[PDB]
Enzyme design. Sequence first.
Site, PDB file in Angstrom:
ATOM      1  CG  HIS B  14      -1.705   1.035   1.697  1.00 16.01           C
ATOM      2  ND1 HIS B  14      -1.179   2.259   1.706  1.00 16.01           N
ATOM      3  CD2 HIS B  14      -3.031   1.288   1.047  1.00 16.01           C
ATOM      4  CE1 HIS B  14      -2.198   3.198   1.868  1.00 16.01           C
ATOM      5  NE2 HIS B  14      -3.523   2.548   1.023  1.00 16.01           N
ATOM      6  CG  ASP B  16      -0.598   6.333   2.667  1.00 11.75           C
ATOM      7  OD1 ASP B  16      -0.242   7.220   1.966  1.00 11.75           O
ATOM      8  OD2 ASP B  16      -2.071   6.313   2.939  1.00 11.75           O
ATOM      9  CE  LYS B  17       1.224   0.714   7.901  1.00  4.22           C
ATOM     10  NZ  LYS B  17       2.640   1.330   8.527  1.00  4.22           N
ATOM     11  CD  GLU B  42       7.811  13.142   8.203  1.00  7.31           C
ATOM     12  OE1 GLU B  42       7.557  11.861   7.779  1.00  7.31           O
ATOM     13  OE2 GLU B  42       7.865  13.829   8.955  1.00  7.31           O
ATOM     14  CD  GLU B  55      13.271  18.165   9.290  1.00  6.06           C
ATOM     15  OE1 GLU B  55      12.731  17.265  10.164  1.00  6.06           O
ATOM     16  OE2 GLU B  55      12.745  18.795   8.485  1.00  6.06           O
ATOM     17  CE  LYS B 166      -7.014   1.344   2.049  1.00  4.72           C
ATOM     18  NZ  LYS B 166      -7.794   2.653   1.861  1.00  4.72           N
ATOM     19  CG  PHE B 235      -6.763  -2.900  -7.012  1.00  3.58           C
ATOM     20  CD1 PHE B 235      -5.815  -2.083  -6.935  1.00  3.58           C
ATOM     21  CD2 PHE B 235      -6.845  -3.193  -5.427  1.00  3.58           C
ATOM     22  CE1 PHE B 235      -4.837  -1.374  -6.158  1.00  3.58           C
ATOM     23  CE2 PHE B 235      -6.098  -2.525  -4.473  1.00  3.58           C
ATOM     24  CZ  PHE B 235      -5.229  -1.574  -4.874  1.00  3.58           C
ATOM     25  CG  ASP B 243      -3.596   6.531  -2.977  1.00  3.66           C
ATOM     26  OD1 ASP B 243      -3.763   7.726  -2.999  1.00  3.66           O
ATOM     27  OD2 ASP B 243      -3.805   5.933  -1.923  1.00  3.66           O
ATOM     28  CB  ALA B 244       0.359  10.429  -3.817  1.00  2.00           C
ATOM     29  NE  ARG B 249      -2.746  11.002   4.968  1.00  2.36           N
ATOM     30  CZ  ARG B 249      -2.956  11.683   3.589  1.00  2.36           C
ATOM     31  NH1 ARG B 249      -2.180  12.638   3.227  1.00  2.36           N
ATOM     32  NH2 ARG B 249      -3.955  11.132   2.774  1.00  2.36           N
ATOM     33  CE  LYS B 250      -3.796   3.614   4.728  1.00  3.11           C
ATOM     34  NZ  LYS B 250      -3.971   4.992   4.616  1.00  3.11           N
ATOM     35  CE  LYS B 270       7.291  11.460  13.528  1.00  2.00           C
ATOM     36  NZ  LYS B 270       6.168  11.769  14.351  1.00  2.00           N
ATOM     37  CE  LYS B 274      13.196  13.544  15.568  1.00  2.00           C
ATOM     38  NZ  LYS B 274      14.515  13.729  15.717  1.00  2.00           N
ATOM     39  CG  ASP B 276       4.579  12.527  17.545  1.00  2.00           C
ATOM     40  OD1 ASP B 276       3.981  12.824  18.403  1.00  2.00           O
ATOM     41  OD2 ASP B 276       4.853  13.116  16.493  1.00  2.00           O
TER      42      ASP B 276
END
Lengths: 380, 380
Positions: B14, B16-17, B42, B55, B166, B235, B243-244, B249-250, B270, B274, B276
């Site tokens: 996928h 994003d993955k 990123e 960074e 998915k 598909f 899809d970009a 995003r997941k 990260k 970080k 998060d």
Amino acid sequence: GTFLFTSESVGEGHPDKICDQISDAVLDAHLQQDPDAKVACETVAKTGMILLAGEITSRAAVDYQKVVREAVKHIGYDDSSKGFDYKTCNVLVALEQQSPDIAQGVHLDRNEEDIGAGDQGLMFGYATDETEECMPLTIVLAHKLNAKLAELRRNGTLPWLRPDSKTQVTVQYMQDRGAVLPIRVHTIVISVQHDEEVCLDEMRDALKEKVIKAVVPAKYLDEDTIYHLQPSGRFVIGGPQGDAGLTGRKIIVDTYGGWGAHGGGAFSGKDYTKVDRSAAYAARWVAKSLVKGGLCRRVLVQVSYAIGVSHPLSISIFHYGTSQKSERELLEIVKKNFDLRPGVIVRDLDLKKPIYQRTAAYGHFGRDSFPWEVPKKLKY
Amino acid sequence: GTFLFTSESVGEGHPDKICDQISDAVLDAHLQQDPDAKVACETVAKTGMILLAGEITSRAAVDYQKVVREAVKHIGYDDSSKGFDYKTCNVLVALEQQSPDIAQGVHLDRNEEDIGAGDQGLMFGYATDETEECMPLTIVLAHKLNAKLAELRRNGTLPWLRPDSKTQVTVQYMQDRGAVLPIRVHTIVISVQHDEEVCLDEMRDALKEKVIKAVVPAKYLDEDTIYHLQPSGRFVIGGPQGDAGLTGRKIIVDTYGGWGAHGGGAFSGKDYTKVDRSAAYAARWVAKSLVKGGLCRRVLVQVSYAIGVSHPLSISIFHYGTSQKSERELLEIVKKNFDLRPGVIVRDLDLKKPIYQRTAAYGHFGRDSFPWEVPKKLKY
Ligand SMILES: C[S@@+](CC[C@H](N)C(=O)[O-])C[C@H]1O[C@@H](n2cnc3c(N)ncnc32)[C@H](O)[C@@H]1O
Ligand SMILES: C[S@@+](CC[C@H](N)C(=O)[O-])C[C@H]1O[C@@H](n2cnc3c(N)ncnc32)[C@H](O)[C@@H]1O
Ligand SMILES: Cc1cccc(-n2c(=O)nc(N(C)C)c3ccc(Cl)cc32)c1
Ligand SMILES: Cc1cccc(-n2c(=O)nc(N(C)C)c3ccc(Cl)cc32)c1
């Protein structure tokens, strides 16, 4: 019964938020010419660069260079001294048409009311009676602190301010049979990009006196409230130069500040067929209708979809114990009053209208009487 | 008392993955040489392109071209017929050093245990006794369906499968004093990229017989279970071409599938400073320790930080009514047993170890006995 809860918000010049605003400026530019544009615009921001990547099928003729630069100008990045300048940054475009495989499975040769969801996924809506706008106080205050910074920057009151900011508010609450009652503000964080000349003590004093006191009612602040103002000590480098930004990286800031729930989908840069946005707006509309209708003090709604299928696969309700009605009875009321097919949501919420850039900072909910913020009168 | 709940998952290909896995391959490559690397990588993926933006300050010498291409090869995008090829795609790098303003406020000249949080933010941890791995059944099943697709693709059982997939699972539950009990699977969605030759009926039959039946216990499936298999009908175009994708995003797929809560931060790309990532891992460790310790059947933990400050600003507990102890007593037990400063979490959870790419697909929780999955024995 007291507890703490924390939420954050970010300003218009936070690099992730810059991307959301540009993605929605692109969406609005297409919708102004083609109400049926299919848009899935991601934005990436880093030093000197805005990159657009994604899929758009539209009859519009959009000047991406102009739309991007105007959005950056509005945010306030207009000089290399601020770390980013709309006039001179690089704008790169990697936009292709929507996949014909998606198009044929979702909307081609389909009656609008019967259009399929543009993807699978899950979405939630939430509402709480703790504020008149039916939003958590933590996130409302966090957003208002960023808005105040932008107001004082723009009116020249605090000319050392720059557009990139973050805020965070911890509220101490009491609870009453599942509803929540704010008591006091326990901790506030504010970090904001600034010029090279201003002193740290001058900034901390201004943030407390001109920002916090102008936003947070005095009844919530006391001698024990903890303030973390410019806690890093220096924030001259900021915007995309300090941290790469991407669209859809502030999804909790965009919604409920951690309260309620989230299905993972980003909102910005997407037309109504992308249920990540339209069904989350409709679920907010349902939740707010249940609370303003007096059925719940607070409530959470889940909905889910399959790509190419119009009707939701599931709908669920969590009332936190704040209704006399069971969750099964509330679900029956929702099913009798709402039709959450994307092709019906578009009509109820007027989702072809180019108002999306307005949603892309300070949260999508609890502001401006957008259609999803006007409760529906319920019949039961 | 019955209700539905839905969660989704996505496969390794996928888009994003793909970005999360590349971001974590970059992080691991740095940590293999410099355990103290500061990484905020990123990734963006679109037709023919991987862009790295962010960074990094590190003593490592990393060959980004090689690291990115090897990650894409592992995922399975190795030919233009599949829509993406590690050998021939464009790899663009826009990586700069970490902002010196962040570095001075967070970690420069600080004792490791007393390092500041790398940002402000809020994070949550969740655990539920409904499965032995203390995760929601909806998301466990959704992940296992994607893993099964990748297994059958890689072993050549279903050679028409491609890496992008998915899944979505809706479970019907009962509740018992705040704990949840799965009854049956109500709906399953599977969408997976495929070659040009295979027929739709052949794919739907294989997905039911070789994928779902090989993953979901028969006791959960019945004549009423709803199957949406290849619901878009076609598909062939997939991966970044369809899809970009972007890193982070997941975030709901990475965590609890909509259950529990989320503070908004992405994990991949990260280092431990970080919060998060590190504090969400520590909060999962706390939650799982409370449930495996027999104090709760399910529990949610919130923590929050300010940039440059080591101790959390707030800690909160929600036990869903599944403890005899109050949330105040559970919070006191957490404070007596855990130290959630990032400089202590790093030591407890061994967060300088280059194991991050392993976390970047199929969820960060409930798998492989990572340190945050090994409960701490509690004293009270
Ligand atoms: C702290 S940065 C995230 C970590 C960063 N990517 C790194 O390389 O360490 C996240 C956000 O914090 C804010 N920020 C940037 N520089 C900062 C500073 N010097 N002090 C405080 N906040 C800062 C900006 O809003 C930025 O988008
Ligand atoms: C449906 S696409 C999202 C919408 C898309 N950006 C658009 O232009 O409409 C999101 C994800 O669904 C999957 N997908 C892509 N093409 C698909 C298709 N033809 N049928 C089903 N799922 C598809 C891929 O996993 C992709 O990353
Ligand atoms: C499942 C979920 C998701 C998100 C938030 C909450 N949640 C909330 O709605 N109410 C809180 N009360 C009333 C005690 C609460 C307190 C602490 C924490 Cl960590 C969360 C809380 C619950
Ligand atoms: C606040 C929050 C966040 C995320 C999930 C839930 N939540 C859950 O934990 N338990 C459910 N039970 C037991 C009825 C439930 C049912 C429906 C919905 Cl929409 C959510 C549910 C709650």
